[PDB]
Enzyme design. Structure first.
Site, short mmCIF file in Angstrom:
data_model
loop_
_atom_site.label_atom_id
_atom_site.label_comp_id
_atom_site.label_asym_id
_atom_site.label_seq_id
_atom_site.Cartn_x
_atom_site.Cartn_y
_atom_site.Cartn_z
N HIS A 17 6.68 108.12 -66.84
CA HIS A 17 6.62 109.45 -67.42
C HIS A 17 5.27 110.13 -67.23
O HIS A 17 5.12 111.31 -67.55
CB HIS A 17 7.05 109.47 -68.90
N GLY B 269 -3.00 109.81 -74.66
CA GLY B 269 -3.67 109.52 -73.40
C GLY B 269 -3.77 108.05 -73.08
O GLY B 269 -4.36 107.68 -72.06
N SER C 249 -0.92 105.81 -72.84
CA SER C 249 0.27 105.20 -72.26
C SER C 249 -0.13 104.58 -70.93
O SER C 249 -0.87 105.19 -70.15
CB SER C 249 1.36 106.25 -72.03
N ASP D 68 10.65 102.65 -67.13
CA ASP D 68 9.59 103.65 -67.29
C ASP D 68 8.30 103.04 -66.73
O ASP D 68 7.20 103.27 -67.24
CB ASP D 68 9.40 103.99 -68.78
#
Ligand SMILES: [Zn+2]
EC number: 3.4.22.-
Lengths: 151, 16
Positions: free
Chosen positions: A29, A109, A111, A53
């Site tokens: 993502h 910020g 991930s 993901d």
């Protein structure tokens, strides 16, 4: 000095990437199918798993890899883009609860960053913060096993 | 576009 965690950015956002077993992993993502910059031009993703993901590029210059956890601990530690360490109690295969909820801003910020065990080994990759009215009390993460498997 | 590296974090705090 070599770093295990890279602070990365795209035109729209900033997040993290973590090198585990020679691969630089991050959240789909944040990166999408984007290529990563290098002084010899962009290098394409080695792995891409929209389902998990997860995406992976060859480990970049100035990095070192993290060792997957093998102790099985539930006392995890999340490292933020600011280098802050946040203790997390593992609740399940892909989730853990912060031992002290923090406002969502504190986890923004991050991930792609690592969830580490007591030995500093990689347990999973921070996927998303689970919030309740702006306060992050839990997090979703991608088990290292998924990465190991993708490889 | 491309993902660029804007910084790095050393987990051991190694200064060297
Ligand atoms: Zn461990």
């Amino acid at each position: 000095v070599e770093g295990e965690v890279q602070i990365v950015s795209t035109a729209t956002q900033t997040f993290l990437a973590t090198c585990i077993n020679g691969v630089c992993w991050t959240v789909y993502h944040g990166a999408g199918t984007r290529t990563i910059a290098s002084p010899k031009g962009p290098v394409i993703q080695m792995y891409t798993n929209v389902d998990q993901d997860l995406v992976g590029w060859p480990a970049p210059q100035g990095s070192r890899s993290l060792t997957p956890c093998t102790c099985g601990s539930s006392d995890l530690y999340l490292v933020t883009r600011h280098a802050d360490v946040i203790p997390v109690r593992r609740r399940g295969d892909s989730r853990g609860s912060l031992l002290s909820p923090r406002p969502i801003s504190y986890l923004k910020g991050s991930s792609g960053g690592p969830l580490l065990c007591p030995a500093g080994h990689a347990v999973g990759l921070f996927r998303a913060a689970v919030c309740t009215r702006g306060v992050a009390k839990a997090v979703d993460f991608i088990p290292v096993e998924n990465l190991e498997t993708t490889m | 576009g491309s993902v660029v590296i804007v910084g790095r974090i050393v987990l051991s705090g190694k200064p060297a």
